[PDB]
Amino acid sequence: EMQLTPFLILLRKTLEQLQEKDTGNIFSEPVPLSEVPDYLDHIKKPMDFFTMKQNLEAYRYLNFDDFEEDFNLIVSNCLKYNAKDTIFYRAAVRLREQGGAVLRQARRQAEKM
Numbered sequence: 001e002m003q004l005t006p007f008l009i010l011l012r013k014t015l016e017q018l019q020e021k022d023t024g025n026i027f028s029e030p031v032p033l034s035e036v037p038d039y040l041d042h043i044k045k046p047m048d049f050f051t052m053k054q055n056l057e058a059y060r061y062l063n064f065d066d067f068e069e070d071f072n073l074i075v076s077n078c079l080k081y082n083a084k085d086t087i088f089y090r091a092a093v094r095l096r097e098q099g100g101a102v103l104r105q106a107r108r109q110a111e112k113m
């Protein structure tokens with residue numbers, strides 16, 4: 001297996017690169033529940049990049065799949081909650097596309113560790 005600290009260095013850089021694709025900063029912080037009062041009704045597990053950074057430092061991500069699972073939640077939650085003809089829905093589609101390539105490259109670096 002691998003050493004913890006270089007893996008976490010790689011996840012930190014990967015998280016920064018995914019945030020870079022969210023040019024609108026739509027997903028930087030939790031969805032404001034005080035402004036979306038019905039959000040938790042059908043979104044079981046909210047996720048966002050700030051929570052992911054906290055989970056990263058809290059060792060919730062010890063393999064690439066758990067990291068990618070929470071990124072996929074950011075995307076899938078947004079596709080689920082929002083109608084297809086919204087800015088939010090299209091932002092999540094774009095993040096899924098642009099983020100997918102970021103993750104493939106980062107995983108190949110992890111797979112060399």
Ligand SMILES: O=c1oc2cc(O)cc(O)c2c2ccccc12
Pocket residue numbers: 026027030031032035036077078081082088
């Ligand atoms: O998925 C979202 O849906 C929203 C719906 C709204 O009506 C209002 C919102 O501020 C959001 C929102 C804000 C930040 C990140 C994601 C979302």
